[PDB]
Design an enzyme around this catalytic site. Structure first.
Site, PDB file in Angstrom:
ATOM      1  N   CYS C 152       0.951  -0.953  -0.004  1.00 55.27           N
ATOM      2  CA  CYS C 152      -0.051  -0.079   0.162  1.00 55.27           C
ATOM      3  C   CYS C 152       0.761   1.467   0.005  1.00 55.27           C
ATOM      4  O   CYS C 152       0.385   2.303  -0.600  1.00 55.27           O
ATOM      5  CB  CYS C 152      -1.059  -0.181   1.153  1.00 55.27           C
ATOM      6  SG  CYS C 152      -0.566  -0.098   2.623  1.00 55.27           S
ATOM      7  N   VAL C 156       0.240   4.534  -2.341  1.00 56.90           N
ATOM      8  CA  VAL C 156       0.001   5.759  -2.059  1.00 56.90           C
ATOM      9  C   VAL C 156       0.862   6.797  -2.741  1.00 56.90           C
ATOM     10  O   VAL C 156       0.807   7.769  -3.159  1.00 56.90           O
ATOM     11  CB  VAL C 156       0.089   5.872  -0.439  1.00 56.90           C
ATOM     12  CG1 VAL C 156       0.074   7.283   0.125  1.00 56.90           C
ATOM     13  CG2 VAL C 156      -1.157   5.060   0.146  1.00 56.90           C
TER      14      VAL C 156
HETATM   15  S1  CLF Z   1       5.016  -2.754   6.099  1.00 59.55           S
HETATM   16 FE1  CLF Z   1      -0.758  -4.080   5.563  1.00 59.55          FE
HETATM   17  S2  CLF Z   1      -0.443  -6.103   4.666  1.00 59.55           S
HETATM   18 FE2  CLF Z   1       0.878  -4.242   3.698  1.00 59.55          FE
HETATM   19  S3  CLF Z   1      -0.325  -3.982   1.464  1.00 59.55           S
HETATM   20 FE3  CLF Z   1      -0.668  -2.574   3.551  1.00 59.55          FE
HETATM   21  S4  CLF Z   1      -2.533  -3.587   4.178  1.00 59.55           S
HETATM   22 FE4  CLF Z   1      -1.630  -5.357   3.180  1.00 59.55          FE
HETATM   23 FE5  CLF Z   1       4.107  -3.498   8.060  1.00 59.55          FE
HETATM   24  S5  CLF Z   1       2.510  -1.418   8.243  1.00 59.55           S
HETATM   25 FE6  CLF Z   1       1.261  -3.001   7.142  1.00 59.55          FE
HETATM   26  S6  CLF Z   1       2.500  -5.097   7.279  1.00 59.55           S
HETATM   27 FE7  CLF Z   1       2.913  -4.145   5.490  1.00 59.55          FE
HETATM   28  S7  CLF Z   1       1.109  -2.602   4.885  1.00 59.55           S
HETATM   29 FE8  CLF Z   1       3.028  -1.516   6.144  1.00 59.55          FE
END
Ligand code: CLF
Ligand code: CLF
Ligand code: FE2
Ligand code: FE2
Lengths: 477, 522, 522, 477
Positions: C152, C156
């Protein structure tokens, strides 16, 4: 079908047989005429089965151990002989009871003398005496023992009567020898009779000189209800709501004491005529107790029965009878209103043992269904006499039907539902015909009484109208 | 009373207050029942070591056997032959039971006839029953073969099957060429598995004894496979599957998988599939004969060795990893076919599953029962899984078999707390699971009553039943399962580990009490 | 304390008195915990209709969702291609999670890389991460294809995958002809299933868009099969099996069944099996393309129709009897191959099982959830079984889908007490199973916590979980099962009926209380 | 293997890499020299991962939400952003607790704002405020809320701090904004630090002006034990048997109140240095509370730790210390007697997060096992300083090991056992190498303390010596 189509159906089906079998089977197949009151003018029954034709019948041990004795909950019943018969019949029949199994009640257990070669060669009476002591040590709360003879016992000349007397005396215990070897008679039927006479001879007289029982004018016994899926309890409740006192149940959820107390009652209520008419007649002869046949299948028969029973007592019971009938009226009417439109007009063929093939017809009719064929494994002509008036004109009757006959009759008649046993069930389902087990209630029930009728209706509807039946034909064929 | 939109069957109908009060009245008025404190006292005594000792001293009484009688096995054997009617000479009560017993396990029709001997036959014997029975059966059910066994009445009165069948042919009741193999199957010798051996050996003799002089071992380049008494459809299927994948010519001798699994398509098929007569006649031309369940095929083995001159290999039932490997290696040796890549991969997938599940299996303690070959295969696989098969019960086992199992236990540290019992029944087993409580039982539906008994002592003493064996009557369609080969081992592993995890979830489902360990991931 | 001969893990160690007392002292001393009466009061309130109404008015809060994010599906899609490395452009935390989530469900390795964008990439974007990432991945793990999706952060920031991959090739980080199909997979649009569709369509475009002018529909005599997001190995397998037995030429496009089930034979295989590049390149030459899970393959469908010119049939997921029938009939039509005897019989065996088990299934009430195609196929089969699917929850479902399911419900009397929910989660489902209690839940492992909650209210309120769907983390090897075709329907039927009978056995196990109905035979 | 052979192994493995990656990875791989005290002379750590190399690392959200905040049982932790992160991390980590889940405790639940396109385009702050009200309605017994930021939050310029202040004031609730977006830092590590600072800034000072808590001289807190499988409970029990009062557990089975009471203790006992050194330093600075590192893995380390802790108190605690040690002596001696002969000489390679790769070495050595390689996902050089003295000479160290490297090192070293995570487990099992999960304890544990050592030993033995490992090669191959 007309009388003449059913008649030519019988003739066509019999064409497969060698002459001896053909001539015999012809006598066991009839087209009903409800004008007849002497069935010995139109069908033969209670004869030997023809070899090799795949009778559905069992044996005298099934009728004694499996049917009459096995349900008695606080006795231990020994399947005496080799291991098979007790194993196949272990917990096959849903004769329900309240007890602590292995402790004070023993119904679903299989006790056996497991005959080996040395027992056949030298006899099993010594083994039987030792087995009794072992039973006493390990099952001290048993209230009596029965010895259910399997084929070899009489054949090798054992004397289980001597063993039962000697051990019974030594242990101050009721030990009942039952000569129900499967070589005797032609079916389960003689097993019932043998069993009845064993109760008479070894149990029923125990309290003949005992006047301590607190008797009342309203004491009855339920004779010949084996409490399949709780059938006897859903009968008992109504009798007691009517103000009666049910001293005994023979033999579903039955205790030895309640059997020994039965000679103290005012009236014997006989559901299963075939299996327990013998002891009923004995009780009238010896104790002066009257008996009467009744039927607790469906609201029409149940209401008629409650009324006929209540009429043997006083105004107080007749009044309670009408209160019971009023109480349950909305309940069974609601069952009819829900299910009869789902079943109206549907046609059933039955094949069962000695009672149900006629007794359930009223219940089907309370749901708008028609019994177009019926028959029995092991009924006698006195059963057929009671059947011809309950069945419609030009319907099919079959005694000790062969597998071949039953299949061929179904192919032509094309019933909407079949009600029979476990050996029949899967055959007819594959043919695309809804099937309900009318021995075991297909693990459902009770079916007796007002509460039973609700379950009966639910069950005939869930199966006859099930979506599966529209699916047997692949759409590419 | 009933409410029409929520109708109650027996359970929970009889828990309604009016039924409860009625049942209390029946008890108090008429049943002269032992007081509840005395019932509780006796129950508790039946869970003790003192009671177990008395129980194990039984010599005459049997309670809750884990075996059945010979002709049951002859009937199952017979069903595996093409267009073959099982026919039991003797008493008809027996046939009603044999059919119903299998009907309930397979949820299928089970066709079998009697010749309905009655008390009258004791004077004269059952010769006339055989003559008319054979004629009637043939005309009515149109089998291509009738396979004849006996009930105990016929054995006690001493009817000579061979002579009766010969006389039936002599006097024209069935054609001379019509196949009527037979076996004496006394219920008071051995058990149902012995009936299977006897029937099979009778059928093998029928088709081969008199025509041996044109036979040459190996000339048809096939391996015969004799399955023995087998009530999992998946077991006939997996063996055929593995052999076909391997490119191995084979004949499965007694193969009921089609007749025990016909489609519901608007017709009833009395017969389906099965071993052909031509397969039995040609069987001596095989390279060899493999017995899948050798501990109940001893009579068959003697015939195959003595008459077919096949050097029957010493193979255990193909259950678990090592014994499946051994079966495949021997079949490779005999056939000349290499073990194919597909089977190597399947093996490795089983091994993968073992690696993935080993931590939950490790040290788990089982009581188990069944027929001898099934029981020993299950013991072996349990050891391979790092499980402890502590109570091993085989009612119909023998001393030589016990010695073999004791040796298997000795080959593994996982066998150190295990005892093998022969001649003992499920009432004996009931004591063992109280006095030396295992984690689970692996057994047939008769086990449910032991589980019931254990729960009554308390939840902490309950021993859950894992249903593997015969008969299984209280679950649906488990007869489709597999216990042989790598497929069977994968199925058994899965069932075992998930039974463990189901029980653990039950024990950890208590809010704020035990659910600290109610893990999402296991 | 521990006894060395019987070591206790957390359960039941912490039930020892000393641990119990310690935990009591911790609570009382330091936790300032709400009184138990208040906890009980609030719990009771959370089971009410009043609470349910507040619960269903949520607009901003999601509790216990029944969906995941797009790139999880892209990764699964990508795993199904031969020697293909899933590569997620963006943040590496995501990849640790995707791998672990699948590791726990399959109990297998799950290979996937990140290009480890950090905060510094917000300034310039992730172009350099892509260049070094692709080069590093290719050299180190030696894939033949790298299939790129996004996290994501990358979405973005607006990274242009196409341009970044092209520039990687232009500047020599990865060869010009090395396949690097891609798809944008924003986690804030749709769900994991949308990620699968996006990835698949990206791969399909990569191999076919520029080469269409030599393609002739039907010229390779095969049917393409697109499975969608699928986490049962038996589902890939049964489709291939059925098509093979019908003699139908086919290409399964995304086929991870080998890489998700490698043998444990002493080596790790990063890649195994999979759809070949040659299969993807030749796919427009098929007769047609069948979508197994059409409700999450809408983008794929537009591409196959618009670019390959395939007339994609309107078929439901092949689950249950009718829809398996329809799938086989359509495959027969397209291919010219008749449905063979083997499949006709298998069908009839399913129907036999339905006739055998119908009495215990009839009227049974279920709550269920999962992905849209799975859920609707399960609903359909339940109606075919005479069951009532009363709470139908599809968190990631849409309006058009719900209309379709509402139409299926309307075609059956067994749908009349059923409601379909979209956008609702397992906290919403929890309320429904309290306020309108069904007999069972059919769901994934997150359902266990709902069962826990129901039991806390009382045993009579407990709703047991039947584990079918994804993820299943608390049982072993259920990912080997099948839900598609007649085989899948047989497996689902068996699981359902025996779940029913297990629960009945539990409720009737009470000695002298409910065991009057503890039948040996059911 | 000699030093020269291990150096050779490293260079050979590095040969696969493009030059930039090779040069980088060379700096993260070392051959131990226990003489070295400054690990900055031999290994680099806490740097970015190289793209495309299959790091085993997670992100800052894992370090904050998954590790530090998530275990706090009576708060509600919001995974704020799209649906993925909270779903993959739901109940993945076995941070055990006692509570009534969904009512007063919330740890295994997944609360999320489930961002959609409109939240990305227009901001999620209005959604967050609404979500907070919905939480309050539906979970009224929550004692505080945390907002665990996922990647998009800072990227799109949301102001969760304003939302937390405004809503926290409106509702008189502790609402903690946590800027743990996974784009921050390089691993889980920065998530720890961020999380510690959020505790400091929004929770820890709440009772600074409250004089009501009655402290004693023996008050301690367990800092950095997340109670994996009950690890903190099997530690706490010993500290309390030694006469101490454990006011708080950070954060396994932790409550918001016990966190707020921690500034009242006399001594902070730090297990996980890496994750909670930050707040331990803060508490020394601000409240004058000293802190000390300890180790409850295996009897040698646990005994040493108990004594070192007791030495900070008075004679009465030192006397109880020796009583505790005497009590458990026969218990762990019995564990060693049973299991050490089963494991003696066996060689293990570890790869874990930030503590265990060194902390568990002693426990292995208590069973006679040798740790021949170890490394960390996200350790810093202060962790490596602590590691080199615990590892033997010439052993292999790896920082942020790549999948490729780990496989290749294992192929050469051929350890008898590997201790790592879920992403590693199935790879090495297929290679025929026994594997134990050393994050989740493979669904077993506890491993801390004396009671945990018994389980640890049982577990290493059951897996290392399992019969399955003899079966990977088909006997025909
Ligand atoms: S580093 Fe989250 S798993 Fe991702 S693509 Fe976004 S919803 Fe799906 Fe860490 S905080 Fe989370 S786990 Fe990744 S997105 Fe960032
Ligand atoms: S009519 Fe018994 S099943 Fe038979 S072969 Fe003997 S052990 Fe076996 Fe009736 S009494 Fe019994 S059931 Fe038959 S044998 Fe006779
Ligand atoms: Fe069937
Ligand atoms: Fe695996």
């Amino acid at each position: 079908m007309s009388r003449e189509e059913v008649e030519s159906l019988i003739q066509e089906v019999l064409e497969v047989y060698p002459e001896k079998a053909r001539k015999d089977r012809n006598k066991h197949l009839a087209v009903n005429d409800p004008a007849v009151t002497q069935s010995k003018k139109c069908i033969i029954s209670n004869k030997k089965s023809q070899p090799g034709l795949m009778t559905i019948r069992g044996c005298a041990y099934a009728g004694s151990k499996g049917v009459v004795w096995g349900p008695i909950k606080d006795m231990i019943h020994i399947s005496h002989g080799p291991v098979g018969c007790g194993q196949y019949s272990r917990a096959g029949r849903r004769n329900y009871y309240i007890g602590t199994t292995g402790v004070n009640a023993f119904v679903t257990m299989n006790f056996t003398s497991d005959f080996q070669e040395k027992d056949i060669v030298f006899g099993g009476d010594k083994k039987l005496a030792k087995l009794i002591d072992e039973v006493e040590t390990l099952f001290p709360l048993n209230k009596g023992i029965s010895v259910q003879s399997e084929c070899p016992i009489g054949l090798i000349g054992d004397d289980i009567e001597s063993v039962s007397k000697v051990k019974g005396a030594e242990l101050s215990k009721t030990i009942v020898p039952v000569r129900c070897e499967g070589f005797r008679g032609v079916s389960q039927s003689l097993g019932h009779h043998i069993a009845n006479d064993a109760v008479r001879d070894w149990v029923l007289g125990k309290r003949d000189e005992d006047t301590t029982f607190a008797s009342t004018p309203y004491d009855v016994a339920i004779i010949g209800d084996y409490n399949i899926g709780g059938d006897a309890w859903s009968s008992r409740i109504l009798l007691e709501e009517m103000g009666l006192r049910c001293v005994a149940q023979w033999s579903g959820d039955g205790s030895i004491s309640e059997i020994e107390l039965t000679p103290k009652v005012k009236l014997n209520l006989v559901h299963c005529y075939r299996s327990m008419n013998y002891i009923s007649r004995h009780m009238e002869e010896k104790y002066g107790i009257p008996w009467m046949e009744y039927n607790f299948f469906g609201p029409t028969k149940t209401i008629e029965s409650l009324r006929a029973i209540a009429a043997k007592f006083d105004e107080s019971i007749q009044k309670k009878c009408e209160e019971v009938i009023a109480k349950y009226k909305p309940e069974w009417e609601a069952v009819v209103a829900k299910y009869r439109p789902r079943l109206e007009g549907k046609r059933v063929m039955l094949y069962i043992g000695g009672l149900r093939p006629r007794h359930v017809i009223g219940a089907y009719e309370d749901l708008g269904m028609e019994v177009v064929g019926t028959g029995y494994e092991f009924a006698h002509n006195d059963d057929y006499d009671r059947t011809m008036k309950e069945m419609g004109d030009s319907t099919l009757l079959y005694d000790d039907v062969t597998g071949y006959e039953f299949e061929e009759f179904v192919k032509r008649i094309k019933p909407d539902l079949i009600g029979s046993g476990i050996k029949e069930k899967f055959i007819f389902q594959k043919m695309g015909i809804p099937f309900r087990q009318m021995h075991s209630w297909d693990y459902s029930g009770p079916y007796h009484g007002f509460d039973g009728f609700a379950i009966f209706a639910r069950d005939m509807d869930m199966t006859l109208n099930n979506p599966c039946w529209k699916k047997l034909q692949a759409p590419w064929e | 009373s009933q409410q029409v939109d929520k109708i109650k069957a027996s359970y929970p109908l009889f828990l309604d207050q009016d039924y409860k009060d009625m049942l209390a009245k029946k008890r108090d008025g008429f049943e002269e029942k032992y007081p509840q404190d005395k019932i509780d006292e006796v129950f508790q005594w039946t869970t003790t070591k003192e009671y177990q000792e008395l129980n194990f001293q039984r010599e005459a009484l049997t309670v809750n056997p884990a075996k059945a009688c010979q002709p049951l096995g002859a009937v199952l054997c017979a069903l595996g032959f093409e267009k073959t009617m099982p026919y039991v000479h003797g008493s008809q009560g027996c046939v009603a039971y044999f059919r119903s017993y299998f009907n309930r396990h397979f949820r299928e029709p089970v066709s079998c006839v009697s010749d309905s001997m009655t008390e009258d036959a004791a004077v004269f014997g059952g010769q006339q029953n055989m003559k008319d029975g054979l004629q009637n059966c043939k005309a009515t059910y149109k089998p291509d073969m009738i396979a004849v066994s006996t009930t105990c009445m016929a054995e006690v009165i001493g009817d000579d099957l061979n002579a009766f069948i010969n006389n039936s042919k002599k006097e024209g009741f069935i054609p001379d060429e019509f196949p009527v193999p037979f076996a004496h199957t006394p219920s008071f010798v051995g058990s149902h598995v012995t009936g299977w051996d006897n029937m099979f050996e009778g059928i093998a003799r029928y088709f081969t004894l008199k025509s041996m002089d044109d036979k040459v071992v190996g000339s048809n380049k096939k391996i015969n496979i004799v399955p023995g008494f087998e009530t999992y459809l998946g077991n006939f299927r997996v063996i055929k599957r593995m052999l076909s994948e391997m490119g191995v010519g084979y004949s499965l001798l007694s193969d009921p998988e089609e007749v025990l699994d016909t489609p519901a398509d608007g017709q009833f098929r009395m017969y389906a599939g099965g071993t052909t007569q031509e397969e039995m006649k040609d069987a001596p031309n095989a390279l060899n004969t493999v017995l899948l369940q050798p501990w109940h095929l001893e009579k068959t083995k003697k015939f195959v060795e003595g008459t077919w001159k096949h050097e029957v290999p010493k193979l255990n039932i193909p259950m678990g990893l090592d014994w499946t490997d051994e079966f495949l290696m021997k079949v490779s040796e005999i056939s000349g076919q290499p073990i194919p890549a597909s089977l190597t991969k399947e093996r490795g997938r089983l091994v993968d599953m073992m690696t993935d599940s080993h931590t939950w299996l490790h040290g788990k303690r089982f009581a188990l029962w069944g027929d001898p070959d099934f029981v020993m295969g299950l013991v072996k696989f349990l050891l391979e899984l790092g499980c402890e098969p502590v109570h091993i019960l085989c009612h119909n086992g023998n001393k030589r078999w016990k010695k073999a199992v004791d040796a298997i236990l000795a080959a593994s540290p996982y066998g150190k707390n295990a005892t093998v019992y022969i001649g003992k029944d499920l009432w004996h087993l009931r004591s063992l699971v109280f006095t030396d409580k295992p984690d689970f039982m692996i057994g047939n539906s008769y086990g449910k009553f032991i589980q019931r008994d254990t729960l009554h002592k308390g939840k902490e003493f309950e021993v859950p039943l894992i249903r593997i064996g015969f008969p299984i009557f209280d679950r649906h369609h488990l007869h489709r399962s597999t216990t042989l080969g790598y497929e069977g081992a994968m199925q058994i592993l899965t069932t075992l580990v998930n039974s463990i995890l189901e029980r653990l979830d039950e024990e950890t489902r208590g809010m704020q009490a035990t659910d600290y360990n109610h893990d999402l991931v296991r």
